[PDB]
Amino acid sequence: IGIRLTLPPPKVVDRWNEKRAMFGVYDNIGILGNFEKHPKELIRGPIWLRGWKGNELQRCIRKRKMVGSRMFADDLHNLNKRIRYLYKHFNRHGKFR
Amino acid sequence: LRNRVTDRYFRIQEVLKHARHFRGRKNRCYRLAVRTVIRAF
């Protein structure tokens, strides 16, 4: 019980597919490109996370600020509630003061 | 990334191999065997 009785299908990884072959290209776009573009501009993803880092509380505050007006009702309610829960946790609870 | 223990079977067998010659359920039930095996050691 709890362990498979047959080997799983072999893992086939094409290490020289185009995505892997060209990984990292243009990561020095600024240093080698007269600084016309910052490498952070190559980052693709959520509009509130491109070229920025923060803890979960900071991410939540940032998302509500940047896209809260476009969020679905149920989603925004949960986000507001998450911000409240994290505010109490980080500011009031923990080992250290 | 969700990680789950995949080799728990072998971890259990490390204890139970020492409890095969025990009497009763403590020779097969890990919860019981582990305590008796420690005492044996």
Partner: peptide, 26 residues
């Protein structure tokens, strides 16, 4: 179904040891 190959491979080796013990080869 759990992810991974190492545990499954290890269990195969044990299943092959037990099979041989049940029927020791000539």
């Amino acid at each position: 179904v759990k992810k991974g190959f190492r545990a499954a491979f290890r269990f195969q080796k044990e299943l092959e040891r037990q099979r041989l013990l049940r029927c020791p080869p000539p």
